[PDB]
Design a binder for this molecule. Structure first.
Ligand SMILES: Nc1ccn([C@@H]2O[C@H](COP(=O)(O)OP(=O)(O)OP(=O)(O)O)[C@@H](O)[C@H]2O)c(=O)n1
Ligand SMILES: Cc1cn([C@H]2C=C[C@@H](COP(=O)(O)O)O2)c(=O)[nH]c1=O
Ligand SMILES: [Mg+2]
Lengths: 251, 277, 50, 1341
DNA sequence: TCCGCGTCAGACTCGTAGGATTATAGCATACGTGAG
DNA sequence: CACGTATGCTATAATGTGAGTCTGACGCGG
């Protein structure tokens, strides 16, 4: 693919395929030419070296270093490592309708609530706004709804308030050691850029407000909303999965 | 524990016979006449020469083995077109062939995006010029300074120096640690976001509804021209192929369809709202 | 360490008591960075099995 | 005795220990080191001189041609630091080197009388270090961090068990050169000595001695003591050395003379030994059976036959003894080898050694390094000599040879870079001595074995690599070419050297973006030591032992400053007084104690020198001008600490501060703070963003001024004198005649840097400190940098703080702030981010920077001027266009929906797109500056041209004012010289100054002075011309950009950010917090006096944290402010200068045993009221580190303020008006706003762009990324029930392409149904496994 | 049973930087497709 | 027929190579 700079950027698999093709075609040539056997042999060694580099580089001894000196990433390397495709792209992924910010106290909140910044929530529930806007006939179509949100018009805030009502949001903190590292809350729209967390759940998250941050995730489907409200809600996860002692308690 | 392809091959080359002048002449006369063994022995004996040149040709494109193999191709053409009748020695003639084939392969295979020899040769001259400029100008050559020296176009000099720019690995992690590769930064541009794709779905669906809201002969002459409902995007003159068969009446009816639809966008709440877009 | 810190924080450590404190402190901090890894590797082995 | 800037505001010192040595220049390492690299030394091989003499002269393979080095020179820098930073180029000097191509005749023997061609060739530009200690690489300020590596020399180490559950300690020697292969010796479980060359395969150690031409008998004579066996008459005898037995058990009855000393089968004690030695025992009779096993030393042959009876190093028997006797040998030299002390190691190693002679040994060595390749004798001699005995491939360096010789107990320090045969044997000897018991193993963690490489050594090495690459090319071309046509410059290439150095200063791990949040961040970054990067440790390699504080770190490395992270212990801040010894070991100052009396004689001791002496502690009490008060002084030696008598004491710590680094030295009551919290405190001070009003710290240490001055961010006066002209831009000082040189005009101009961008997009602004017409001395602060008060370092703002809970608004470290803080714009900060717009050339055509942009509101285009560039001063907000640009589109094949749309508005708007640079979303500020870089050939923009008009006229004005002020100042001197011996006061002023070339006086020294001033005047006259031509050329000069790029427009924005909930704040005791709420003034706890508290911090974040420093800082802070409130009250009522003087003198001279004296009096009345006016906003106090203020001193100071000794006050709740039911600790804590603003970290995403292969959304806010849903986070949903939430996260939210669009449509349609699919990542996985040639199919239902 | 071999090692965040490095010869005929 | 791309041949003799090391742990296989 072309970078913005006019330059191109490519996978190392291309360098490894080109190695294999060059040496293979040169072998075809040296066979057509009836070359002496010592040279044919060298080319067959080099061909096996190139295929072995292409499949799994580094296993057959000294891995083929490309441009920096770093060994070329081969096929097996894209599957194998923790970084491969299993651990990185398949057993976990980056996610839509996700946000984050610094956390701060919300002592005024009830146990089932969390302060969610206005601008953050505007963005996370964009399709839900577009939807109500067209059912009220305030928006003629989706691109006009987008432009009404871009202008952040006063009626849009009122619609956004209506969508967030009774809609649970997942808060997550790294590291997620046990299941209470994810909890659902009913969000409360707040002016300001910081997420407000209920004190009593700070224990489960191991949350202290000296700058920790939290991920926000929006359960989209009716099923996901119900699993968040029934199974993952803060109020409903009072006891720990390990001991029978409660985790939610004043401090 | 001799496992290395290189050391194995160089062991085998050392294990060869070295040729003299009169031996080269005997073998070369038999070789050109079409001796099997003569060809093999002249090649095998002169493998050492390729390696020597291949050794002073590394860190430029391919690996030592790669260069060696390519060089060996030059040795074969050298034995094929050697003249034993001329008193001048083989080593001198072969050196040309070996260097030629190595250089030619190094100009092609080395670059991921295959650069043509013509541009490569031009580039050589630009670079050599830059070197002489740099030694006398303590600073480095400008594109314009190089262009002045060769009496060539600044645009042509810049195009060439651009082609010199070599390729960045996408798989390579950049954040110093293996934190993120370039692939993870660089987004799929040909693929639209679901937001953008959904907007086009809304417009495509609205069109069908918009076509079944105006005149029946106004949506039958506006749609099939732009290729909205029809199969092919025709022009004012080409709408005659269907049933219209007119040039003036097609153009009056096309614009009559758009004028009633401009009022439909003014009333719904777009017009100047969706003019910026 | 065979020599304990006689002082407390209100009293003020002296240069030697503070320097001696450093050892324990830094081993603690290095422990959080490094050991959470083998701890975490155990979590992951356990999860895969069950 | 105080300086002018100290007379304005004096800090009260609670320190009691008089400082014999002042804090040195803190940026010493970087400057000295690089200065040595560029420094021209004829002899002292340092940097380039060394590099050239090492490689050169390079002679051809044929030997006809050679290239030799003469000398080098650095051209002056093409662009100043300023122009380099703006343009985005490296600040460098061109390296021009004189080289002589000399040619020999092949026909004459070595006739040098053929061709000598000498010319000055360009080999690269070398990046230069700034006066501050930084390099500007591609327009970015970077620091090359000093490195810490294992010193060359020898090291004796040992696997402590590890290998063989046997649990055997296997000793090893490692010889480490500066350049070359490593030489390892090691023991095996079976006590066989082995050699690893270059840590390859194992070889028997004796083989290396055979390669150095050692016969078997010579080897044995080297390691083994001989024991002589005389065969007299028939009985066997042996020459005894009284001790040798020693701690052995007697195997035979030992009889001496006729009388029995040992009993057979009993252990020989010290008494037997002294009895035998005093009796003078030399022969003892022994049984023949005792020799069975003894090892013969020499070859013994039959003099009759001349054939070998027994070879050297052979185990003797009863029959070999018999054969030896009858041949005619009645003396047998045998190896003394008694286990225990003298082990037979080399004897057993010779039996393992398969080689025989020298050649066989050289072949086996050759076969190890180059296995397979047949040996030749020439090849094996060449290889072995080229390993450790070639001047070109092996170099221990001065430090290697020196540490090597000291490790082998030599007298001589200096010597050969190559290993001698004697060296290797001595090393083997010492290894075996250690495996014997007589010897110790060197420590690897000992700082005496860890050496510092700052810059100059590392630049030198990269430069040598460049030269080596060049040598191959050069030697290659010298041999091939005809010698006479060919000159040296056609052979040399500059690009290899330039590339080696560019890769170091640009790609290298140790070259990193300077950390520039604040002065302390900069200063601490430049004095960093890293064990990481090239030639060092890795995070994988790094254990637990290296990371921990080593005893030797005392006075050299900070024990309390290290990243809390994976880099914990590998990165180290340098200590305060620490410095590099000539060889690059760290050393620390110590006061010599002579005859018990403690002199001011100061000695810098290295890690190894320190171990040898007993060093008293700094806090040790000295007696008034002589010896220690106390009899048993607390000292340290041999790396451990206890009490000593006075006569034993050799030395003493120079300052109490020397243990600690710069950053930690700024923490006041460090003594009362836990080392962990103190670490994070020193670490967060570096993150402190400077506020709009730089506020001094009320509770300081004294390092405040040192750091502000040495950082270089403050303008300091070199010359001093009186200020001629102040301006918010410039300061001109007229120099005093005593420092003012009579050559040039004596007027210094300091140009102040106005509001400029930092690397962290913070603000760098210099304001003038001094007023118009103020007298100043050398080293006075003339202008304050960004986070500096009158000369002192001011990282944040002190505040009235009360320790008490609020309504959970300070829950876990959460901070409750008063609205008054926001109102007073304290912790308001301005960010300056640079944005670029690049006009490139594409396959379709060049991009245009016109204001003419398809589909754009007039609102947007209002702010752009003719060219398409935003106006200076224009306020902008997210989505506003800064620089308009359009990307030409070729044959845009639109659809039927787009073709009908383009037909409706008719806004076809040409074949062009919109790629305009617009303000990033949510960031908002004011355009302060615009820069345009164009290619030379292309026609300039209207706006670019008016910019050049400004720069040209401004340049003209600047230079004109230079020549005018310099001429006025120069004739002002001529006027004074002419009066000397020629009274013409009124007569000289009337005729024009321009017609003074005629004016002179009689031929004396004064006439020569007139000539000096006249030659300077004209020199300045032409200089002004060539300066102006240079400026004009640079302003017209069209810049060479990247290929593809036609022009670049750089916009500089300034944003003012207010303090707000989510923003991160900390103190200096490692005490962080996030602001939870801004409380109305009415609501905040208030005093009896009615004064509201600024910040309410939680008491429960103190006893757990064990940083008690913050509370002492608060008590003292209130006492400081107490005295400021008294002075404020006295200044409000004017009152008497006498009365103010009284109170202020009683205040400064309070402390029980205050070191600092302040004999106020001498201060003139005007100095005193300027001083009181500064002391009014709180008397600044200094609590040194480990010599700080005592509680009793703080309570005494509080009484002087009429504040309570408890430092607790009665508080009233602002809301209720009722009193709090117990007194609350209130005072002033100096607080810092760290770089971590919620404004920046806040991010949110619904749908966005998606990754190339995996199709998952991107990561990071800059790429508008979705949060990573990790394995950990997935397992949480697995533990719950939540199966739909998980599938969502796997499929429609990430890869599933069809699914995500379909579900988006459903959510706008309000269906809230998933309709899942297949994640594209899995389809890739399949393709990746089939690419391996594994058939992986989906088998259907 | 001893010792080279090879597979292991927490979770998220942001901020980044560099395109750097390299040399190739010059010219005539041949091979092949596209413009006027 | 011009333009882009490729295969051709050069005759003093020359004919054998050439990075970074050091984690600590555990479990099989020869
Ligand atoms: N490298 C780190 C640092 C922190 N954390 C997590 O974040 C928590 C809080 O870190 P920190 O705030 O530094 O520690 P506290 O114990 O809250 O102490 P304080 O804030 O008072 O320093 C840790 O306990 C841990 O769960 C982590 O996983 N990895
Ligand atoms: C340094 C660091 C921090 N954190 C979390 C724990 C608390 C917040 C703030 O960290 P700081 O104040 O270091 O981030 C981590 O989770 N990992 C880390 O390495
Ligand atoms: Mg925290």
């Amino acid at each position: 693919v072309p970078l913005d700079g006019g330059r191109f950027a490519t996978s190392d698999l291309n360098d490894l395929y080109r190695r294999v093709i060059n040496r293979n075609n040169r072998l075809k040539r040296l066979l057509d030419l009836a070359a002496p056997d010592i040279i044919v042999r060298n080319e067959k060694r080099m061909l096996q070296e190139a295929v072995d580099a292409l499949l799994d580089n580094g296993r057959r001894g000294r891995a083929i270093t490309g441009s920096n000196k770093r060994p070329l990433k081969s096929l097996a390397d894209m599957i194998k490592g923790k970084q491969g495709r299993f651990r990185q792209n398949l057993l976990g992924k980056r996610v839509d309708y996700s946000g984050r910010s610094v956390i701060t106290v919300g002592p005024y909140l009830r146990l089932h609530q969390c302060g969610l910044p206005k601008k953050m929530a505007l963005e996370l529930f964009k399709p839900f706004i577009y939807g109500k806007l067209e059912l009220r006939g305030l928006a003629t179509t989706i691109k006009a709804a987008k432009k009404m949100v871009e202008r952040e018009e006063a009626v849009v805030w009122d619609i956004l308030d209506e969508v967030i009502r009774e809609h649970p949001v997942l808060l997550n903190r790294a590291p997620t050691l046990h299941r209470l590292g994810i909890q659902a809350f009913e969000p409360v729209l707040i002016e300001g850029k910081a997420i407000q967390l209920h004190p009593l759940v700070c224990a489960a998250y191991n949350a202290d407000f000296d700058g920790d941050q939290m991920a926000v995730h929006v359960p989209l489907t009716l099923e996901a909303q119900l699993e968040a409200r029934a199974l993952m809600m803060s109020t409903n996860n009072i006891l720990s999965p390990a001991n029978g002692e409660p985790i939610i308690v004043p401090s | 524990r001799v496992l290395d392809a290189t050391q194995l091959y160089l062991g085998e080359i050392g294990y060869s016979p070295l040729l003299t002048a009169e031996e080269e002449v005997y073998f070369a006369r038999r070789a050109l006449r079409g001796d099997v063994a003569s060809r093999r022995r002249m090649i095998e004996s002169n493998l050492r020469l390729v390696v020597k040149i291949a050794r002073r040709y590394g860190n430029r494109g391919l690996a030592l083995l790669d260069l060696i193999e390519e060089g060996n191709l030059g040795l074969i053409r050298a034995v094929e077109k050697f003249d034993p009748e001329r008193g001048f020695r083989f080593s001198t003639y072969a050196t040309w062939w070996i260097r030629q084939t190595i250089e030619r392969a190094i100009m092609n295979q080395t670059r991921t995006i295959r650069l043509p020899i013509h541009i490569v040769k031009e580039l050589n001259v630009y670079l050599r010029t830059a070197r002489e400029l740099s030694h006398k100008l303590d600073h480095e050559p400008s594109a314009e300074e190089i262009a002045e020296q060769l009496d060539k176009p600044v645009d042509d000099v810049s195009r060439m120096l651009r082609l010199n720019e070599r390729i960045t690995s996408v798989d390579t992690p950049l954040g110093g640690d293996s934190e993120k590769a370039l692939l993870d930064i660089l987004a799929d541009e040909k693929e639209n976001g679901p937001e953008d794709t959904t907007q086009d779905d809304d417009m495509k669906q609205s069109i069908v509804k918009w076509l079944f809201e105006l005149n029946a002969k106004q949506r039958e002459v506006l749609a099939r021209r732009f290729g909205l409902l029809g199969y092919e995007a025709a022009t004012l003159e080409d709408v005659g192929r269907e049933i219209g068969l007119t040039r003036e009446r097609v153009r009056q009816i096309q614009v009559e369809g758009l004028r009633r639809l401009r009022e439909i966008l003014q009333t719904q709440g777009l017009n100047i709202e969706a003019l910026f877009l | 360490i065979e020599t304990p810190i006689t002082a407390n924080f209100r009293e003020g450590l002296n240069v030697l008591q503070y320097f001696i404190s450093t050892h324990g402190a830094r081993k603690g901090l290095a422990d959080t960075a490094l050991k959470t890894a083998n701890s975490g590797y155990l979590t992951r082995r356990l999860v895969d099995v069950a | 005795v105080y300086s002018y800037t100290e007379k304005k505001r004096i800090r009260k010192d609670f320190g009691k220990r008089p400082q014999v040595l002042d804090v040195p220049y803190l940026l010493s390492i970087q400057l000295d080191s690089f200065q040595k690299f560029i420094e021209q030394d004829p002899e002292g091989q340092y940097g380039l001189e060394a590099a050239f003499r090492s490689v050169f002269p390079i002679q051809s393979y044929s030997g006809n041609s050679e290239l030799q080095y003469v000398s080098y020179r650095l051209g002056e820098p093409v662009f100043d630091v300023q122009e380099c930073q703006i343009r985005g180029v490296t600040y460098s000097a061109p390296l021009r080197v004189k080289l002589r191509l000399v040619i020999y005749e092949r026909e004459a023997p070595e006739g040098t009388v053929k061709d000598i061609k000498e010319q000055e060739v360009y080999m690269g530009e070398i990046p230069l270090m700034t006066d501050n200690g930084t390099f500007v690489i591609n327009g970015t300020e970077r620091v090359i961090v000093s490195q810490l590596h294992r010193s060359p020399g020898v090291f004796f180490d040992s696997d402590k068990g590890k290998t063989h559950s046997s649990g055997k300690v296997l000793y090893n020697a490692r010889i480490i050169p500066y350049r070359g292969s490593w030489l390892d010796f090691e023991f095996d479980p079976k006590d066989n000595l082995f050699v690893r060359i270059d840590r390859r395969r194992k070889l028997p150690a004796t083989i290396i001695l055979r390669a150095l031409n050692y016969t078997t008998e010579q080897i044995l004579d080297l390691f083994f003591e001989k024991v002589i066996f005389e065969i007299r008459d028939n009985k066997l005898q042996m020459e005894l050395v009284p001790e040798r037995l020693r701690g052995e058990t007697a195997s035979f009855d030992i009889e001496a003379n006729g009388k029995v000393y040992v009993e057979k089968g009993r252990r020989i004690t010290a008494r037997h030994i002294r009895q035998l030695e005093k009796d003078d025992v030399k022969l003892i009779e022994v049984p023949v059976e005792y020799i069975a096993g003894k090892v013969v030393a020499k070859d013994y042959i039959d003099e009759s036959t001349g054939e070998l009876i027994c070879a050297a190093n052979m185990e003797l028997s009863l029959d070999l003894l018999a054969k030896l006797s009858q041949s005619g040998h009645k003396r047998i030299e045998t190896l003394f080898t008694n286990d225990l002390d003298h082990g037979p190691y080399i004897s057993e190693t010779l039996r393992v050694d398969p080689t025989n002679d020298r050649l066989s040994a050289l072949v086996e060595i050759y076969r190890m390094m180059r296995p397979g390749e047949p040996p030749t004798r020439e090849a094996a001699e060449s290889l072995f000599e080229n390993l450790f005995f070639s001047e070109d491939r092996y170099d221990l360096s001065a430090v290697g040879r020196m540490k090597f010789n000291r490790s082998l107990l030599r007298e001589e320090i200096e010597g050969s870079g190559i290993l001698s045969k004697d060296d290797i044997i001595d090393v083997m000897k010492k290894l075996i001595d250690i495996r014997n018991g007589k010897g110790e193993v060197d420590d690897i963690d000992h700082l005496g074995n860890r050496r510092i490489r700052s810059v100059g050594e590392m630049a030198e090495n990269q430069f040598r690599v460049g030269l080596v690459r060049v040598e191959r090319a050069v030697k290659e071309r010298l041999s091939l070419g005809d010698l006479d046509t060919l000159m040296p410059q056609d052979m040399i290439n500059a690009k290899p050297i330039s590339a080696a150095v560019k890769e170091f200063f640009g790609s290298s791990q140790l070259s990193q973006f300077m950390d520039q949040n604040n002065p302390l961040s900069e200063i601490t970054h430049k004095r960093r030591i890293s064990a990481l990067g090239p030639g060092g440790l890795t995070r994988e390699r790094a254990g637990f032992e290296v990371r921990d504080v080593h005893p030797t770190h005392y006075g050299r490395v900070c024990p309390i400053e290290t990243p809390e992270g994976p880099n914990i212990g590998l990165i180290n801040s340098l200590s305060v007084y620490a410095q590099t010894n000539e060889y690059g070991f760290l050393e620390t100052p110590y006061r010599k104690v002579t005859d018990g009396v403690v002199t001011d004689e100061i000695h810098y001791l290295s890690a190894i020198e320190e171990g040898n002496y007993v060093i008293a502690q700094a806090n040790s009490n000295l007696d008034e001008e002589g010896h220690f008060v106390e009899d048993l002084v607390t000292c340290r030696s041999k790396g451990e600490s206890s009490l000593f008598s006075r006569d034993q004491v050799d030395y003493m710590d120079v300052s109490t501060q020397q243990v600690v680094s710069v950053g930690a030295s700024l923490i006041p009551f460090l003594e009362h703070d836990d080392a962990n919290r103190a670490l994070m405190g020193a670490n967060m001070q570096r993150q402190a963003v400077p506020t709009l009003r730089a506020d001094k710290p009320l509770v300081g240490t004294g390092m405040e001024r040192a750091v502000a001055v040495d950082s270089g961010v403050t303008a300091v006066a070199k010359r001093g004198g009186v200020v001629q002209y102040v301006d918010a831009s410039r300061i001109v000082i007229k120099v005093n005649e005593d420092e003012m040189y009579p050559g040039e005009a004596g007027i210094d101009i300091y140009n102040l840097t106005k509001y400029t961008r930092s690397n962290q997009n913070t603000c760098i602004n210099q304001m003038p400190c001094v007023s118009l017409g103020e007298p100043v001395e050398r080293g006075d602060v003339l202008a304050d940098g960004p986070s500096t008060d009158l000369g002192e370092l001011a990282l944040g703002q002190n505040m009235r703080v009360a320790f008490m809970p609020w309504n959970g608004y300070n829950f876990e470290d959460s901070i409750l702030v008063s609205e008054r803080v926001v109102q007073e714009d304290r912790f308001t900060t301005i960010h300056i981010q640079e944005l670029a717009c690049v006009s490139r050339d594409t396959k379709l055509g060049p991009e245009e920077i016109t204001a003419d942009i398809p589909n754009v509101g007039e609102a947007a285009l209002s702010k752009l001027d003719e060219s398409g560039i935003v106006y200076i001063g224009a306020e902008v907000t997210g989505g506003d266009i800064l620089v308009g640009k359009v990307t030409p589109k070729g044959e845009t094949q639109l659809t039927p929906e787009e073709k009908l749309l383009r037909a409706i508005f008719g806004e076809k708007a040409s074949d062009v797109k919109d790629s305009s640079l617009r303000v990033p979303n949510g960031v908002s500020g004011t355009v302060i500056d615009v820069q345009v870089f164009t290619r030379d050939g292309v026609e300039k923009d209207k706006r670019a041209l008016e910019i050049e008009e400004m720069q040209l006229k401004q340049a003209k004005k600047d230079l004109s004012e230079e020549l005018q002020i310099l001429e006025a100042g120069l004739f002002s001197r001529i006027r004074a010289v002419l009066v000397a011996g020629g009274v013409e006061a009124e007569k000289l002023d009337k005729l024009p100054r321009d017609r003074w070339l005629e004016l002179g006086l009689t031929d004396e020294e004064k006439q020569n002075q007139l000539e000096q001033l006249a030659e300077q005047y004209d020199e300045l006259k032409h200089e002004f011309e060539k300066k102006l031509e240079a400026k004009r050329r640079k302003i017209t000069q069209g810049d060479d950009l990247a290929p593809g790029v036609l022009k670049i427009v750089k916009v500089y924005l300034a944003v003012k950010r207010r303090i707000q909930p989510g923003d991160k704040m900390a103190g200096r005791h490692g005490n962080k917090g996030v602001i939870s709420k801004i409380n109305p003034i009415e609501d905040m706890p208030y005093d009896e006096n009615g004064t509201p508290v600024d910040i309410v911090l939680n008491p429960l974040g103190v006893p757990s944290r064990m940083n008690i420093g913050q509370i002492l800082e608060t008590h003292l802070g209130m006492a400081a402010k107490g005295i400021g409130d008294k002075i404020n009250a006295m200044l409000k009522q004017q009152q008497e200068v006498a009365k103010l003087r009284e109170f202020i003198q009683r205040a400064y001279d309070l402390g029980a045993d205050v070191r600092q004296k302040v004999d106020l009096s001498t201060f003139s009345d005007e100095e005193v009221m300027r001083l009181a006016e500064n002391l009014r906003k709180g008397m600044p106090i200094a609590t040194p580190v480990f010599d700080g203020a005592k509680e009793a001193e703080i309570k005494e100071l509080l009484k002087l303020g009429d504040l309570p000794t408890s430092g607790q006050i009665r508080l009233y709740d602002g809301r209720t008006g009722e009193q709090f039911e117990r007194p609350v600790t209130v005072g002033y804590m100096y607080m810092l706003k760290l770089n971590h603003l919620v404004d920046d970290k806040m991010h949110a995403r619904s749908t966005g762009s998606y990754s190339l292969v995996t199709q998952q959304p991107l990561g990071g806010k800059a790429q508008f990324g979705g949060q990573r849903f990790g394995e950990m986070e997935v397992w949480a949903l697995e533990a719950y029930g939540a199966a739909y939430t998980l599938q969502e996260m796997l499929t429609v939210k990430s890869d599933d392409v069809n699914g995500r669009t379909k579900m988006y449509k459903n959510i706008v349609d309000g269906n809230h149904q998933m309709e899942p699919g297949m994640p594209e990542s899995f389809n890739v996985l399949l393709k990746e496994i089939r690419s391996l040639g594994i058939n992986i199919e989906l088998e259907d239902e």
